[PDB]
Amino acid sequence: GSTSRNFSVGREGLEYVWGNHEPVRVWAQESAPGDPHGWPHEIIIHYYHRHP
Amino acid sequence: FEHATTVPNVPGIPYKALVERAGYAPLNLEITVVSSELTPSTNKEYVTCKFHTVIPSPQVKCCGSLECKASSKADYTCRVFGGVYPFMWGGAQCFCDSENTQLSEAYVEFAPDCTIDHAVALKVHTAALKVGLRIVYGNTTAHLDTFVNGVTPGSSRDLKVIAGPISAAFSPFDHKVVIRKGLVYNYDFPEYGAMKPGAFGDIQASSLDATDIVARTDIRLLKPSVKNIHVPYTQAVSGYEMWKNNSGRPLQETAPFGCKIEVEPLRASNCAYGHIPISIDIPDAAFVRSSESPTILEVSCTVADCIYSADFGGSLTLQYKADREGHCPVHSHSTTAVLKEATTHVTAVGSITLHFSTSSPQANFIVSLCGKKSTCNAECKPPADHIIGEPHKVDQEFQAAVSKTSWNWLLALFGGASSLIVVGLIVLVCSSMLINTR
Amino acid sequence: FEHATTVPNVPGIPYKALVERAGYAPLNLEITVVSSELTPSTNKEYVTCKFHTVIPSPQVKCCGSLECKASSKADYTCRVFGGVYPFMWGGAQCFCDSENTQLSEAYVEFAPDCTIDHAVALKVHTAALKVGLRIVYGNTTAHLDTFVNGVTPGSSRDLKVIAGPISAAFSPFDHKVVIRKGLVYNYDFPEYGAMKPGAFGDIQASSLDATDIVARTDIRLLKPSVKNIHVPYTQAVSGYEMWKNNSGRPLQETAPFGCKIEVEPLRASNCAYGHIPISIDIPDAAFVRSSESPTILEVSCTVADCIYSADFGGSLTLQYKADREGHCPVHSHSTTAVLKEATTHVTAVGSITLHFSTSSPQANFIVSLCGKKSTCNAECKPPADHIIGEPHKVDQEFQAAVSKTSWNWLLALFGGASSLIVVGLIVLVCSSMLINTR
Ligand SMILES: *[C@@H]1O[C@H](CO)[C@@H](O)[C@H](O)[C@H]1NC(C)=O
Ligand SMILES: *[C@@H]1O[C@H](CO)[C@@H](O)[C@H](O)[C@H]1NC(C)=O
């Protein structure tokens, strides 16, 4: 039908092959919500969404 | 001379480095793998496919008795009967009543269409690796391919490259593996001679045009129950077809590390693991002595902005003052920072702009021009988009991955927790010694 | 009916055994390994032999200049010259005094005798054993050939024998191995691409009629001096004939455990090590009733003479009574004795002889006769001559190897010393805590 499937990429990559199409590579980059540059109520947010 | 360097094993992304001799100008050196094939050692056991149950014509002796002989064809089967009385389209084909004995017979061989969709079964031992390099030094590009074992010289146009042995030793191919029609499944087939009625390895032969076919397919016969002539046989279902229905996924969507499986030499080409410790023998013709390369008199780095990510996010600026209008090799001497441009034309005075890509929030790396060093230092922001379509160029390494203000706000706390107790202990022993005069 | 048995893997000598069932008569069973063939799974790597330096005719350009390209033949080597003036039989082959060049190229290929005189390098691993058997039970022989992995069955005329795994596994080969004219050596050759000039392996090819011939053999040209035209060169010694000088002994007279080593499939046939367990599915139609066999009482041995050698030197007699004639099996139920008759003829009240062998100087073993245990003791003596030409039958067992005289002197001495310290200890403790009263 007309569906949608979540997945989970890593640091090293993820490829998925939809049918007869060519495989497409996807990498993720460290985009934690915050900033590692001050106000210590907030440094422990950026270093928690990566490596909790 | 020869310069040792461990290039990482990721296909496509180059690993820049520069070499240094005394009295000679420095020379850049770009190393990149472009395609790497992984080929194992192949031992073939047999070939199986769908069978074809042949029944030769029923031998009938009128007014006598029979008993079999021995043969060697696959699943040879004898069962004489007693007191038969057959019937053709002309009724009463035989004459002598109540003791006619017929001889049934059954055996098997391959299907006629077995040449296309047979399933070769193999055995794999201790694969070896072959990488395709691409070396660019001093505007002289050299193509070559070499073996990865540390004694095999891959030579190409006066440039001897001895790739040493890789660290990790594995393959996606386990010990037993079948192959049909290009699709590489992965399966623990029965060893040769050991049939099973109703599973893979049901009918085995060392070649498809052979005559030493062996089989054990559980053919039990029946006594003929209707007046006409036939041969009532029953046989178990084919192990190849019922294996094919329950085959599972092939190796092309289960093999780790991104390996693409080519089938015709059974290779596992173009995937990424470990490091490749190589060494490049630079020829002595690409070296001009240091009196002729224009030396730079002072440099001072200053960066502009960062986005530490996969792509070339950070921008760089050196401000120099040089001697003449020649060239300069450019290399950053870190392991978390890599530069886009490798050489730049120089002026007696002028500026420059470079590009780097890093993964740490502080850019405290060292950038070398022709001869001198100048430390760059600023802080760098995380990226905005969560997913990018190209892989990272340097690693994470978890020492400089933590920020500077995080260390300056935690190491003060740990240093205070140590300082309060060492002050408490020294004033304890001082007070006890000062009262201890009595 | 299953019957587990661990026969010793040494060819030629049989292995006496009785099977037994309740309500039936027991019957003999002997299992000899008539032949065995230990074949490994191997992998061809390259064919090498003595090379042949071809030198094509030199190219001279009259009053000009030349340079060499890159070729791909086996060890191509070119370098130009200048200032020549070559002479043929009719001289003056150019027309300017020392302003011209000549070319000089050289390469190798195979000899026209390497189709008989080559040396096929291989790479063996994981040898898997095969055994030809000879089963005979109740004067009915059978010949079987089976694999000695614990799955693959061996079937011949309503008799199914499955051989268990090996006790301890080895193959007499190393990992790398080479072959020429049937003589299997044992060498660690340089692999494909890693040629050194002057050892075994400086010619590499897929097959001998292939084209991808790769080679390095230290061929360096020299400058000609004489006015006549030729090309001088120099080259290292052929490493194939240097290997052939001091190759060593072949492995047909260096392999342990004593086995003929065939070549054309690379067998390691017919040597003897360990024990292999089998289990024989005897058909129940080949049995006889216990209401049919001659039942006996009054069984007692009488030993004529004993000698512990590897022939059938010890003689032995029996006394019996029976109630009807026929055949009955004979068997010794020890591990230090075998018979040499497996069936005998029994009369009503008679008495017969036998022959045995032993490796123990104290023959205390239990013979059987038609299913009736009877112990009979004997005493033996060392042999006369001490080298024969037929292998031993029985191992040493470490406890029947010492005689009863050695044990009773030894343990009488130990019992004297132990009884002495125990009587001293008990007198010490009881007299102490009897005298200490007050
Ligand atoms: C190529 O390299 C040589 C040697 O360093 C240099 O002199 C030349 O300028 C380079 N070519 C270009 C186009 O810069
Ligand atoms: C073979 O054995 C059977 C019983 O085991 C016996 O009756 C027969 O006489 C034997 N054959 C010969 C030739 O003696």
Ligand 1 mean position, distance from CA B139 (Å):
7
8 A C-beta contact, residue C21 and residue C82: no
For a pocket test of ligand 1, which of B29, B137, B140, B327 has the largest count of ligand atoms closer than 8 A to its C-beta? B327
A37, B309: Cβ pair inside 8 Å? no
Residue B63, Ramachandran bin (φ over 0: left; ψ between -120 and 50: alpha; else beta): left
In C222-363, at which residue ranges do the beta strands (DSSP E only) sit?
233-234, 275-281, 296-302, 314-322, 326-332, 343-346, 353-356
| Chain A interface test: which of B249, B254, B307, B388 (most A C-beta within 10 Å) | B388
Residue C220 burial (CB count, 10 A): 11
The distance of Cα C331 from the centroid of its chain, to the nearest Å, equals 31
> How far apart are alpha carbons C44 and C177 in whole angstroms?
10
8 A C-beta contact, residue C103 and residue C66: yes
Question: C74: which 2 tokens?
Answer: 């086996």
> How far is the CA of B39 from the CAs of B36, B130, B263, in angstroms?
10, 8, 10
The distance of Cα C318 from the centroid of its chain, to the nearest Å, equals 42
Does ligand 1 come within 6 angstroms of the Cβ of B26?
A: no
8 A C-beta contact, residue C125 and residue C176: no
Question: C420: which 2 tokens?
Answer: 């002495």
Partners of B143 on chain C (C-beta within 8 Å) are none
> How far apart are alpha carbons B357 and B392 in whole angstroms?
9
Partners of B192 on chain C (C-beta within 8 Å) are 147, 152
Instruction: Put the strands of the sheet holding C77-78 in their side by side order.
Output: C51-54, C105-110, C77-78
Looking at CA atoms only, how far is residue B56 from chain A in angstroms? 46
> How far apart are alpha carbons C395 and B2 in whole angstroms?
63
Does ligand 1 come within 6 angstroms of the Cβ of B139?
A: yes
| Chain B interface test: which of C41, C188, C195, C196 (most B C-beta within 10 Å) | C41
> How far apart are alpha carbons C365 and C52 in whole angstroms?
72
Q: Which atom of ligand 1 is nearest to the CA of B138?
A: 2
Question: B171: which 2 tokens?
Answer: 């393959």
> How far apart are alpha carbons B383 and B358 in whole angstroms?
11
User: Any residues with CB less than 8 A from the CB of C222 and at least 6 apart, and which?
Assistant: C232, C233, C234
Hey, is the C-beta of A29 within 8 angstroms of any chain B C-beta? yes
> How far apart are alpha carbons B340 and B315 in whole angstroms?
10
A27, B382: Cβ pair inside 8 Å? no
8 A C-beta contact, residue B177 and residue B268: no
DSSP states along C73-111: STT-EE----S---B-SS---SSSTT--EE--EEEEEE-
Question: C7: which 2 tokens?
Answer: 């026969």
Residue B397, Ramachandran bin (φ over 0: left; ψ between -120 and 50: alpha; else beta): left
In C223-274, at which residue ranges do the beta strands (DSSP E only) sit?
233-234
8 A C-beta contact, residue A20 and residue A38: no
Rounded to 5°, angle at Cα C215 from C212 and C216 = 155
Technique of determination: cryo-EM
> How far apart are alpha carbons C427 and C430 in whole angstroms?
5
> How far apart are alpha carbons C433 and C159 in whole angstroms?
75
Q: What is the 3-state secondary structure (H, E, C) of C170-224?
A: CCCCCCEEEEECCEECCCCCCCCCCCCCCCCCCEECCCCCCCCCEECCCCEECCC
Phi, psi of A49 (to 5 degrees): -75, -20
Of C169, C162, C167, nearest to C135 (Cα)?
C162
Chain B residues contacting C via beta carbons under 8 Å: 41-43, 123, 125-126, 147, 149, 151-154, 157, 190-194
Looking at CA atoms only, how far is residue C329 from chain B in angstroms? 32
Residue B271 burial (CB count, 10 A): 20
Whether chain B lies against chain C with 3 or more Cβ pairs closer than 8 A is: yes
> How far is the CA of C30 from the CAs of B392, C12, C338, in angstroms?
71, 12, 12
A27, B406: Cβ pair inside 8 Å? no
| Ligand with an atom nearest the CA of residue B294 | 1
8 A C-beta contact, residue C61 and residue C96: no
User: What is the β-pairing status of strands B160-161 and B101-110?
Assistant: unpaired
Residue B308 burial (CB count, 10 A): 25
User: What is the β-pairing status of strands C275-281 and C4-8?
Assistant: antiparallel
Hey, is the C-beta of B362 within 8 angstroms of any chain A C-beta? no
Phi, psi of C371 (to 5 degrees): 90, 50
**Ligand 2, atom 11: closest residue by C-alpha:** C139
8 A C-beta contact, residue C179 and residue C75: no
User: Any residues with CB less than 8 A from the CB of C21 and at least 6 apart, and which?
Assistant: C1, C287
Residue B64 burial (CB count, 10 A): 10
> How far is the CA of C62 from the CAs of B414, C69, C188, C223, C326, in angstroms?
86, 19, 51, 18, 108
> How far apart are alpha carbons C61 and C56 in whole angstroms?
16
Question: B368: which 2 tokens?
Answer: 């070398």
Instruction: Put the strands of the sheet holding C343-346 in their side by side order.
Output: C343-346, C326-332, C364-369, C373-377
> How far apart are alpha carbons C345 and C139 in whole angstroms?
13
Does ligand 1 come within 6 angstroms of the Cβ of B285?
A: no
Of C367, C389, C393, nearest to C315 (Cα)?
C367
| Chain A interface test: which of B405, B407, B411 (most A C-beta within 10 Å) | B405
The distance of Cα C359 from the centroid of its chain, to the nearest Å, equals 25
B149, C125: Cβ pair inside 8 Å? no
C194, B152: Cβ pair inside 8 Å? yes
8 A C-beta contact, residue B176 and residue B188: yes
In C1-81, at which residue ranges do the beta strands (DSSP E only) sit?
4-8, 16-19, 27-42, 46-48, 51-54, 60-61, 77-78
Residue B378 burial (CB count, 10 A): 14
User: What is the β-pairing status of strands B59-61 and B27-42?
Assistant: unpaired
The distance of Cα A50 from the centroid of its chain, to the nearest Å, equals 10
Of B45, B48, B12, nearest to B30 (Cα)?
B12
**Helices H / strands E in chain B, number of each:** 2, 30
> How far apart are alpha carbons C23 and C25 in whole angstroms?
7
Phi, psi of B350 (to 5 degrees): 165, -175
Looking at CA atoms only, how far is residue A49 from chain B in angstroms? 12
Secondary structure element (H or E) that encloses residue C285, with its range:
none
Ligand 1 mean position, distance from CA B332 (Å):
21
8 A C-beta contact, residue B156 and residue B144: yes
The distance of Cα B34 from the centroid of its chain, to the nearest Å, equals 14
The distance of Cα C343 from the centroid of its chain, to the nearest Å, equals 34
Instruction: Put the strands of the sheet holding B349-351 in their side by side order.
Output: B296-298, B319-322, B349-351
Q: Which residues pair with B35 in a beta bridge?
A: B132
Residue C25, Ramachandran bin (φ over 0: left; ψ between -120 and 50: alpha; else beta): beta
Residue C91 burial (CB count, 10 A): 10
> How far apart are alpha carbons B424 and B428 in whole angstroms?
6
8 A C-beta contact, residue A29 and residue B265: no
User: Any residues with CB less than 8 A from the CB of B373 and at least 6 apart, and which?
Assistant: B299, B333, B366, B367
Residue type, C174: D
Of C5, C8, C16, nearest to C331 (Cα)?
C16
A36, B382: Cβ pair inside 8 Å? yes
8 A C-beta contact, residue C357 and residue C310: yes
Question: C66: which 2 tokens?
Answer: 């030349």
Looking at CA atoms only, how far is residue C74 from chain B in angstroms? 14
Which of B361, B383, B403 is closest, CB to CB, to A29? B383
Residue C300 burial (CB count, 10 A): 12
DSSP states along B194-255: ---TTSSSSEE-SSTT-S--EE---EEE----SSS----EEEPPPHHHHHHHT----GGGT-
> How far apart are alpha carbons A16 and B182 in whole angstroms?
20
> How far apart are alpha carbons B379 and B307 in whole angstroms?
10
C149, B43: Cβ pair inside 8 Å? no
At C413, is the secondary structure helix, strand, or coil? helix
Q: Which residues of B79-110 are buried (b: 16+ CB within 10 A; e: fewer)?
A: bebeebbbeeeeeeebeeeeebbbbbbbbbbb
The distance of Cα C305 from the centroid of its chain, to the nearest Å, equals 38
8 A C-beta contact, residue B71 and residue B105: no
8 A C-beta contact, residue C205 and residue C213: yes
> How far apart are alpha carbons B301 and B368 in whole angstroms?
10
> Chains contacting C with at least 3 CB pairs below 8 Å?
B
B386, A47: Cβ pair inside 8 Å? no
Question: Would you call B196 exposed, middle or buried from its count of C-beta atoms within 10 A (0-12, 13-18, 19+)?
Answer: middle
> How far apart are alpha carbons B386 and C315 in whole angstroms?
94
> How far apart are alpha carbons B418 and C230 in whole angstroms?
87
> How far apart are alpha carbons B342 and B184 in whole angstroms?
43
8 A C-beta contact, residue A35 and residue A27: no
- The structure was resolved to a resolution in Å of 3.3
User: Any residues with CB less than 8 A from the CB of C244 and at least 6 apart, and which?
Assistant: none
For tokens 């004979």, the residue is: C330
> How far apart are alpha carbons C18 and C84 in whole angstroms?
94
> How far apart are alpha carbons B15 and B8 in whole angstroms?
8
For tokens 């007499």, the residue is: C172
Of C378, C356, C372, nearest to C298 (Cα)?
C372
Q: Which atom of ligand 2 is nearest to the CA of C140?
A: 1
Secondary structure element (H or E) that encloses residue B126, with its range:
strand B119-137
Of C316, C349, C313, C309, nearest to C331 (Cα)?
C316
Whether chain A lies against chain C with 3 or more Cβ pairs closer than 8 A is: no
> How far is the CA of C158 from the CAs of B116, C161, C284, in angstroms?
37, 10, 10
Does ligand 1 come within 6 angstroms of the Cβ of B329?
A: no
Residue type, C401: A
For tokens 């001495």, the residue is: C413
> How far apart are alpha carbons C393 and C148 in whole angstroms?
23
> How far apart are alpha carbons B132 and B36 in whole angstroms?
6
At B416, is the secondary structure helix, strand, or coil? helix
At C357, is the secondary structure helix, strand, or coil? strand
Which of B42, B43, B147 is closest, CB to CB, to C193? B147
Residue B220, Ramachandran bin (φ over 0: left; ψ between -120 and 50: alpha; else beta): beta
8 A C-beta contact, residue B48 and residue B203: yes
Question: C315: which 2 tokens?
Answer: 């003689």
> How far is the CA of C238 from the CAs of B145, B151, C203, in angstroms?
28, 21, 10
